[PDB]
Nucleic acid binder design. Structure first.
Length: 58
DNA sequence: CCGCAGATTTTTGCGAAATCTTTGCAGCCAGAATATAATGTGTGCATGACGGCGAATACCC
């Protein structure tokens, strides 16, 4: 819930290139949950960086 | 008007290949796995008929 803004901001870049924005943010939320399930801080990286690639893939 | 020849009919035989399932192959394809920097924002709003009409809140008397 706290990271939905990242999904919205990322998806609005892809909205100008066709496809509904709402579907994009829903898929990005799916990818965000996938990243959350796989996130760790033992790596030392920022969560936003890790979630960015997941959201882009979704 | 009848028996054989031309034409037509009867019968046995071999090659050919195609099809159905199985096996090996290659292009297609799906999910699973990895850790680059990026979170209150974008956004389309495109816009000058005309008549009828009930529904939905407002407001005077």
């Amino acid at each position: 819930e706290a990271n939905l803004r990242l999904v919205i901001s990322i998806a609005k870049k892809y909205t100008n290139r066709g496809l509904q924005f709402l579907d994009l943010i829903q898929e990005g939320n799916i990818g965000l949950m996938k990243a959350v399930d796989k996130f760790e801080y033992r790596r030392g990286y920022k969560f936003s960086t890790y979630a960015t690639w997941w959201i882009r893939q979704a």
